[PDB]
Structures are given as structure tokens and as C-alpha cells.
Amino acid sequence: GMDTRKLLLTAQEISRMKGEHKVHFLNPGAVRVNKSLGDAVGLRHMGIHLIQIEPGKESTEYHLHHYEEEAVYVLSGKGTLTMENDQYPIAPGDFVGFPCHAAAHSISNDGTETLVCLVIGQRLDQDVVDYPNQHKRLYRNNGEWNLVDMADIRVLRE
Amino acid sequence: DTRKLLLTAQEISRMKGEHKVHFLNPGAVRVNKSLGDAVGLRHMGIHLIQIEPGKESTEYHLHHYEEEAVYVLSGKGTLTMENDQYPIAPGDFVGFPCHAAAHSISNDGTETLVCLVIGQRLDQDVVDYPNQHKRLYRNNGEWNLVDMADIRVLRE
Amino acid sequence: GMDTRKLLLTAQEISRMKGEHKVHFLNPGAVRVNKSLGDAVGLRHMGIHLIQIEPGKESTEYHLHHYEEEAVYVLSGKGTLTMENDQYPIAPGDFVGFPCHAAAHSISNDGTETLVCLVIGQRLDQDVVDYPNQHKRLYRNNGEWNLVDMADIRVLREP
Amino acid sequence: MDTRKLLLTAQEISRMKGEHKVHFLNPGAVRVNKSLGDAVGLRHMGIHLIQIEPGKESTEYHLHHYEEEAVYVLSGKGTLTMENDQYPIAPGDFVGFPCHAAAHSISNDGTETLVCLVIGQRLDQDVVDYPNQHKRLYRNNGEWNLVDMADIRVLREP
Ligand SMILES: [Cl-]
Ligand SMILES: [Cl-]
Ligand SMILES: [Cl-]
Structure with missing residues (x-):
């Protein structure tokens, strides 16, 4: 029926989406155009x-x-995946997945063309996210965000 | 050990993949590479x-409970969604909020249809098969398939 | 503050509650005065x-x-607890708990005074409940209640 | 299975060994605990x-914030403190706590032992506030994180 046409986004509907300019709240260098296919x-x-x-x-x-899985599938362009210590070049057709607690990561585009990826993630009401280079832990609980310096956390049990 | 979380394109090309046939449709045959399980x-x-x-x-x-989506990588197909057909092609995306739309995809083209299928994995789901008139209740490993004619709907 | 007083239900408030007359839809003998302390x-x-x-x-x-836990704590009087193929007498201060899938049960009052209990249970959006004596399985899924005769269920897999 | 294991008689309960429990933040919160559910x-x-x-x-x-809790008084008398008001509690009284409804504690200022059933949800994740200590506990699958409220940056709320 015509009322489910909206569930299909053609390649050219996607191309013409403006998306959102997003800057990560802890990294002014983390800037991207985000087209939320799921929200559309x-x-x-x-x-x-x-x-x-x-x-x-x-x-x-x-x-x-700690609770949300995440993954990335590269569509075009080339980048550098930083995962724990290590750096890995990435290219189109590459996939990286992150089970909970497995590995801290970020991706940079140190190339000369736009890096285009699908980012796929769970959306959960509760999560804990660590930002090791900032020494901060975020507790996110049903819309309440609580950011705490790791030095201020008393770990009673691990 | 962190290298195991990355599958290069070349590793993905080398994956054998699994031959999969849907339990209710002998014509629903694919070769599947589970990137998430890997x-x-x-x-x-x-x-x-x-x-x-x-x-x-x-x-x-x-x-009823698991969300699902499909992103077309190569080739062409026909999406059947709530009894309407739509051609699909590389770069097309279709997503299914729970209870929104029944669907299937067929490859009536000449070349292989390659897609990424993205879904939640939950311990409990309910799945309707409207052309078979069957509802599947899947509950932690127990699968119960029931003809819709045998389901008595109750009020709260 | 005053808006929190409603979280306390004193003994006299409780004894005065009329409660709801509740009859199980599959058992006309399962008739009880129910005072829902939690909903209150x-x-x-x-x-x-x-x-x-x-x-x-x-x-x-x-x-x-199959998914919701349930338990009973006897406050007064006596009853007969049936679990699977066994019957046990119950009396004040006794406690019975039902882990998921552990045992089908019912309680009868075959004594001479009222049987008074606290019933404690989970409330989950999804559950499956078997009524073996009626040959029925209930699948409850957020507001969709589906009752199926057990012979009409094709079991394709089990864990 | 052996169904008799699901029934604890009043006598069995009487006989059960109590666990001596002291709350981690209040040395005055001492009780003898018999876990009927665990049994x-x-x-x-x-x-x-x-x-x-x-x-x-x-x-x-x-x-x-996430686990509901309730108390039902079996014998003795106590004083319920809830949102800074004090209420006498006695046998047959019930008090329940929907999430975020009210901070409380119970004190036995009587002369007899106070005996209660305490009924609660058991969740893998919870957040618990201790207003008199100005601390928040984030409990996430066995990891217990205690943080002074002064050290929490609230970036967003619901
Ligand atoms: Cl297009
Ligand atoms: Cl830490
Ligand atoms: Cl019937």
C-alpha cells in the first residue's frame, strides 16, 4: 500500500538527503555528515x-x-582504524564489529577523498561508554546523561 | 586479538559462506556470510x-519484536512489501519497524543480487507469514508454529 | 512530603479495601477477593x-x-498445594516459589477458615503460560493475548 | 524434578540460618536476612x-531508579522515613516504591524485633541515590561504581 512506500529509501532519495552535521561532544575533530537511514x-x-x-x-x-554493540562497513574512500593500541588501514568492503567491552576504537580519514561508511548500532535505554583518552566514563540512563572523570569513580566491585 | 574484529574485503571474498534455505520457502535460497558472527x-x-x-x-x-533492514550492494531485485512491488537496485535501503510491513525480495534479474541484511537478535520474537497463514512464536530456542485459524485472540 | 503518603498502605487501610472479585476465566472454582497492594x-x-x-x-x-516468576506466602488459614503430580498441605508462614518452567501448580482451600496469602509475581511484557488441564497454551505479547489448543502447536525446535 | 524443593514450611524458615548483613554505607543498618527466593x-x-x-x-x-522494592510488616514496629517525613509502621502495613518515587529508610525504635518481608526486582543494571551521603551508585552487571554527586556532570536529563 502507498502508506509503506516510506519504508524504502532509494539510492537517489539517500543521495538527496541533507543529513545532519554532527560534531562529537568530546572531540571537535570528530565531524561528519550523518544520514540516519533508520530514523528516516x-x-x-x-x-x-x-x-x-x-x-x-x-x-x-x-x-x-559496555552494553551497545556497534559495527562499521566501508562503502567508499579509505581511512585508519585505531583499535586499542593498533592502527589498521581500512578500505571499501571492509567490516569492523564491536561486541561489548571488546575494544576501544575511533576511525580517522587521513586520505584525500571522502570516507563513506555505514555505521550500525544497537539503541538501548541504558549504556556506559568509556572515553579512555579523555579519562571519562559516561553513564547514559533513559535520557539522563552523567559524565564522570574516571578518577572520581570509587570501584567497589569490578 | 583486536585484529579479529576487522574483516577486510579480501577476507570477506575468501569466506565460503553458508547455503541457507528458508524453512517455509524452498525458493528462498541464498549464500550467507555472517559478518557479525565472525x-x-x-x-x-x-x-x-x-x-x-x-x-x-x-x-x-x-x-513483531525484531527490527530488520536491507541495504543493496550489487545487482537488482523486486521488493514485495504489503502486496506492492518495487524494483530495488544498488544503494537502496529498506527498513522494517516492528509490525510495519510484511515483505520478501526476489531476484528476477540476470546477475547475482548482493545485500547486507541487518537485524536485531532477540531471545523472543513473533513472526507472521501471511501467505502461509502461520504465526511463529520463537521463545528461547522453542519454536512453535501455529495456523492462524487456530489462534483465539483474547482481550486483556 | 504529602504526595508520598500514598506509598504506605496501613493494615487498617488494607483491611478496609473491598478488593476485586476475581474469577479465573478457565476455572469457575478459582474465586478470590484480590487486593492489589502494588497497583494501589x-x-x-x-x-x-x-x-x-x-x-x-x-x-x-x-x-x-515460562518467563514470569511467581511466589506465595501464607498469612492465615490452610490450603492444599498441587504441584505437578504431588499435593502438599500449606499453612501460615509457609512459602512457595516458582522459578520459570519449574512446576505447574494450583492451591485449593479445603479447610474451614478463609485462606489468606500474599501473592508476589513479575509483570513482564511477554510470557507464555500453560494450562495443562485445559490443554491450552497462552502466548501473551504486549497486549496481544493468543490462546492455542496444545494439539494445534507444531513444535519445530526445543532448547 | 523434585517439587518439594519449591516449598519452604514455616518451620524450615524458622530453622534457616540467617545471613548477618550490614549496609555498605550505614553501619547502623544491620539485619538478619533469610533469602526465601534464593532458597x-x-x-x-x-x-x-x-x-x-x-x-x-x-x-x-x-x-x-530501575528496581522496584516493597516492604510488608509481619511483626514488631518501626519508623518509616520517606522523603523526610516519619511514619509509624506496624504489622500488616505495606509500603511500596515505584522507581524514582521516594527515598526511604526504616528504623526499629521499638522494643521487639522488627520482622518484615522485603520484596524486590533483581536487575543487572540499577542506579541508586543515597541523598544523606550525596552519593550515587551505578551498578552494572557486577561492577559497582560509587560517585559523589558533586562529581557528576549532568549533560542531559529526561
Ligand atoms: Cl535511486
Ligand atoms: Cl574506572
Ligand atoms: Cl475451549
Whole structure:
């Protein structure tokens, strides 16, 4: 029926979407154009985003999720995946997945063309995200965001 | 050990993939590469699928609890969604909020249809198959398939 | 402050509550006065009920939950607890708990005074409940209640 | 299975060994705890028969964000403090706490032992406030993080 045409986004509908200019709240160098495919069609439990990262910019602030899984599939362009210590070049057709607690990561575009990726994530009401380079932990609980310096956390049990 | 979370394009080309046939539709045959299982994802499925000409992606279905989406990488297909057909092609995306639309995809083209299928993985779901008139209740490993004519709907 | 006083239900408030006359839809003998202490204060994820079962009546239709836990604490009087193929007498201060899939049960009051219990249970958006004596399975899924004769269920897989 | 294991007679309960419990933030919150739920295998609710002696408390004044809790008084008398008001409690009284409704604690200022059933949700994640200590506890699957409220940057609320 005509009332489910909206669930299909053709390639050219996607191309013409403006998307949002997004800067990560802890990294002014993490700047991207974000086209939320999931929000366009009404998905509420996962995020599916077509992102464009220009040369010299990053995908995020180096981070590790405790409850939300996340993944990235490269569509065009080339980048550098930083994962724990290590750096890995990435290219189109590459996939990276992050099970909970597995590995902190960020992606940079140190190339000469736009890096275009699908970013795929769970959307949960509660999560904990660490930002090791900032020494901060975010507790996110049903819309309440609580950012705490890791030095201020008394760990009673691990 | 962190290298295991990255699958290069070349590694993905070398993956054998699994031959999969949908339990309710013998024409729903694909070769599936579970990218999420290869890196250890447990709450989402992310699969790279190949559907040959004349075959389908699934049995026409509707989820009550798991969200699902499809992103076309190469080739061409026909999406059947709430009894309407739409041609699909590389770069097209279709997503399914729960209870929104029953669908299936067929490859009536000449070249392989390659897609990424992205879904939630939940311990409990209910899935309708309108052309079979069956509802599947899937509950932690127990699968119960019931003809819709045998379901008595109750009020709260 | 004053807006919190409603979270306390004193003994006299409780004894004065009329409660609801509740009859299980699968068992006309399962008739009880139900005082929902949890709904009175605003609990949403648990059910806490003070129930009265008169002599000759029962607590429920014999059933098994697959996802919601349930428990009973006897405050006064006596009853007969049926679990699977076994019957046990119960009396004041006794406690019975039902982990998921553990045992089908019902309680009868075959004594001479009212049987008064606290019934404590989870409230989940999804559950499956079996009524073995009626040959029925109930699938409850956020507001969609689906009752199916057990012979009409094709079991394709089990864990 | 052996169904007799799901039934605890009043006598069995009488006989059960109590666990001596002291709240981690309040040395005056001492009780003897009998976990009825654990004794029979319940995993998603806590049902405890507790004994609080004269001069002791049930807890450190607190508020749950995700787990519901309730108390039903079996014998003895106590004083319920809830949102800074005091109420006498006695046998047959019930008090319940929807999430975020009210901070409370119970004190036994009587002369007899205070005996109650404490009924609670058991969740993997919870947030708990202790207003008298100006601390927040983030409990996430076995990791316990205690943070002074002064050290929390609230970036967003609901
Ligand atoms: Cl297009
Ligand atoms: Cl830490
Ligand atoms: Cl019938």
C-alpha cells in the first residue's frame, strides 16, 4: 500500500538527503555528515547511519561501549582504524564489529577523498561508554546523561 | 586479538559462506556470510547475502519484536512489501519497524543480487507469514508454529 | 512530603479495601477477593496481591509460567498445594516459589477458615503460560493475548 | 524434578540460618536476612524475610531508579522515613516504591524485633541515590561504581 512506500529509501532519495552535521561532544575533530537511514524509516531499536567523513576528520571520540554493540562497513574512500593500541588501514568492503567491552576504537580519514561508511548500532535505554583518552566514563540512563572523570569513580566491585 | 574484529574485503571474498534455505520457502535460497558472527556480535545479525536469479530472500514475513533492514550492494531485485512491488537496485535501503510491513525480495534479474541484511537478535520474537497463514512464536530456542485459524485472540 | 503518603498502605487501610472479585476465566472454582497492594501504590514491574480464598475455592487454574516468576506466602488459614503430580498441605508462614518452567501448580482451600496469602509475581511484557488441564497454551505479547489448543502447536525446535 | 524443593514450611524458615548483613554505607543498618527466593531458586525477584533489632535500621536512606522494592510488616514496629517525613509502621502495613518515587529508610525504635518481608526486582543494571551521603551508585552487571554527586556532570536529563 502507498502508506509503506516510506519504508524504502532509494539510492537517489539517500543521495538527496541533507543529513545532519554532527560534531562529537568530546572531540571537535570528530565531524561528519550523518544520514540516519533508520530514523528516516522509523527504526527505534537500532541505528543505521550513512556517514561521510572528510579528510582530516574522525568518526568519533575514541570509545568503548559496555552494553551497545556497534559495527562499521566501508562503502567508499579509505581511512585508519585505531583499535586499542593498533592502527589498521581500512578500505571499501571492509567490516569492523564491536561486541561489548571488546575494544576501544575511533576511525580517522587521513586520505584525500571522502570516507563513506555505514555505521550500525544497537539503541538501548541504558549504556556506559568509556572515553579512555579523555579519562571519562559516561553513564547514559533513559535520557539522563552523567559524565564522570574516571578518577572520581570509587570501584567497589569490578 | 583486536585484529579479529576487522574483516577486510579480501577476507570477506575468501569466506565460503553458508547455503541457507528458508524453512517455509524452498525458493528462498541464498549464500550467507555472517559478518557479525565472525567478529563475535551477539545482539545484531549483519549478513552479506547472495541471491541468485530466480530465488528469494525469505518467506514473506512480518516481525513483531525484531527490527530488520536491507541495504543493496550489487545487482537488482523486486521488493514485495504489503502486496506492492518495487524494483530495488544498488544503494537502496529498506527498513522494517516492528509490525510495519510484511515483505520478501526476489531476484528476477540476470546477475547475482548482493545485500547486507541487518537485524536485531532477540531471545523472543513473533513472526507472521501471511501467505502461509502461520504465526511463529520463537521463545528461547522453542519454536512453535501455529495456523492462524487456530489462534483465539483474547482481550486483556 | 504529602504526595508520598500514598506509598504506605496501613493494615487498617488494607483491611478496609473491598478488593476485586476475581474469577479465573478457565476455572469457575478459582474465586478470590484480590487486593492489589502494588497497583494501589503504583508498582508496575511486580504484582503484590493480598488474596482471600474461601473454603471450597481455588487460587487459580493449574498453570505453568515460562518467563514470569511467581511466589506465595501464607498469612492465615490452610490450603492444599498441587504441584505437578504431588499435593502438599500449606499453612501460615509457609512459602512457595516458582522459578520459570519449574512446576505447574494450583492451591485449593479445603479447610474451614478463609485462606489468606500474599501473592508476589513479575509483570513482564511477554510470557507464555500453560494450562495443562485445559490443554491450552497462552502466548501473551504486549497486549496481544493468543490462546492455542496444545494439539494445534507444531513444535519445530526445543532448547 | 523434585517439587518439594519449591516449598519452604514455616518451620524450615524458622530453622534457616540467617545471613548477618550490614549496609555498605550505614553501619547502623544491620539485619538478619533469610533469602526465601534464593532458597527455592527464584532469579528475577528478591524475597527476603528480615529481622531488625531495636536500635538498628533496614538500609541507608535511598532511592532506586530501575528496581522496584516493597516492604510488608509481619511483626514488631518501626519508623518509616520517606522523603523526610516519619511514619509509624506496624504489622500488616505495606509500603511500596515505584522507581524514582521516594527515598526511604526504616528504623526499629521499638522494643521487639522488627520482622518484615522485603520484596524486590533483581536487575543487572540499577542506579541508586543515597541523598544523606550525596552519593550515587551505578551498578552494572557486577561492577559497582560509587560517585559523589558533586562529581557528576549532568549533560542531559529526561
Ligand atoms: Cl535511486
Ligand atoms: Cl574506572
Ligand atoms: Cl475451549
